[PDB]
Design an enzyme around this catalytic site. Structure first.
Site, PDB file in Angstrom:
ATOM      1  N   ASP A  17       0.796  -1.220   0.000  1.00 32.95           N
ATOM      2  CA  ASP A  17       0.000   0.000   0.000  1.00 32.95           C
ATOM      3  C   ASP A  17       0.832   1.275   0.000  1.00 32.95           C
ATOM      4  O   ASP A  17       0.272   2.362   0.175  1.00 32.95           O
ATOM      5  CB  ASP A  17      -0.945   0.005   1.198  1.00 32.95           C
ATOM      6  CG  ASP A  17      -2.202  -0.788   0.945  1.00 32.95           C
ATOM      7  OD1 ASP A  17      -2.538  -1.003  -0.240  1.00 32.95           O
ATOM      8  OD2 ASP A  17      -2.852  -1.194   1.930  1.00 32.95           O
ATOM      9  N   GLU A 113      -2.832  -5.976   0.073  1.00 31.03           N
ATOM     10  CA  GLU A 113      -3.337  -6.360  -1.238  1.00 31.03           C
ATOM     11  C   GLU A 113      -4.378  -7.469  -1.202  1.00 31.03           C
ATOM     12  O   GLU A 113      -4.816  -7.915  -2.267  1.00 31.03           O
ATOM     13  CB  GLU A 113      -2.172  -6.805  -2.127  1.00 31.03           C
ATOM     14  CG  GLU A 113      -0.955  -5.914  -2.040  1.00 31.03           C
ATOM     15  CD  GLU A 113      -1.060  -4.715  -2.949  1.00 31.03           C
ATOM     16  OE1 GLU A 113      -1.804  -3.766  -2.620  1.00 31.03           O
ATOM     17  OE2 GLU A 113      -0.410  -4.744  -4.013  1.00 31.03           O
TER      18      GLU A 113
HETATM   19 MN   LIG Z   1       0.028  -2.364  -4.366  1.00 31.79          MN
HETATM   20 MN   LIG Z   2      -4.927  -1.816   0.628  1.00 30.30          MN
END
Ligand SMILES: [Mn+2]
Ligand SMILES: [Mn+2]
Ligand SMILES: [Cl-]
Length: 191
Positions: A17, A113
């Site tokens: 992220d 993810e």
């Molecule tokens: Mn990513």
């Molecule tokens: Mn995320």
DNA sequence: GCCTTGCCGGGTAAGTTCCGGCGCG
DNA sequence: CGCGCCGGAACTTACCCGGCAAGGC
């Protein structure tokens, strides 16, 4: 090592992220950034930042944890050349992680993810080579999985963990006490 | 009879890099 | 003068989500 477990967990969040950024400015100023982005500021302030602060203290990094509010998400940011290369060198050497660091990295990557419903166990990323590394780690751990191109528009692959081993994945990997617990596994364990 | 999972479209929660400062040798 | 740490946020899409239905048992 505990530090190595938290490092690998944060790397999964970062690679997932956030990112590692080497900036060149006017002039010739520069900056090195370790970043995690997330919509929930609670999750950033209460789960991510305390872990990053511990790592900053154990590495004697003097940079501070910045929490910046963006238009669509919050950003956890550390401006540190020493921390940037600490994670960068860990990323190039990721194929050498022991089992403990592997579990912690898969934890962080899934928090970033993964399918958070846990109805299905999927991990999305355009970096197929990174997913193939995770795939061999999961197989060695006894968790069957497949990788396919899930988004033909953008080139995003998915790693699908077989539901046949959903208990193995959730209990032995996502819920391991050898490294910090993800939010949803911690709420599951404490009911 | 239904569980698993490949494949898909929707749109937002991410990612990425620019802007302005400042400190310090 | 050169380089690295702050604080902000503009700007594009890479994720996640969730539906569908082929296949398997
Ligand atoms: Mn990513
Ligand atoms: Mn995320
Ligand atoms: Cl927000």
């Amino acid at each position: 090592e505990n530090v190595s477990g938290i490092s690998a967990y944060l790397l999964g969040l970062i690679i997932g992220d956030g990112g590692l950024y080497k900036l060149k400015y006017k002039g010739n100023r520069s900056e090195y950034r370790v970043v995690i982005t997330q919509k929930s500021e609670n999750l950033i302030k209460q789960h991510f930042a305390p872990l990053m602060q511990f790592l900053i203290d154990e590495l004697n990094v003097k940079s501070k944890i910045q929490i910046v509010k963006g238009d669509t998400r919050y950003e956890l940011r550390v401006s540190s050349k020493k921390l940037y290369y600490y994670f960068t060198n860990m990323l190039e050497r990721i194929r050498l992680c022991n089992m403990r660091e592997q579990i912690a990295f898969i934890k962080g990557l899934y928090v970033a993810e993964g399918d958070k419903t846990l109805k299905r166990l999927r991990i999305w990323n355009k970096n197929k080579a990174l997913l193939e590394i995770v795939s061999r780690w999961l197989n060695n751990l006894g968790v069957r999985n497949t990788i396919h191109l899930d988004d033909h528009r953008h080139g995003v692959y998915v790693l699908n963990i077989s539901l046949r081993d959903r208990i193995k994945f959730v209990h032995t990997i996502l819920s391991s006490h050898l490294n910090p617990l993800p939010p949803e596994a911690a709420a599951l364990e404490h009911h």
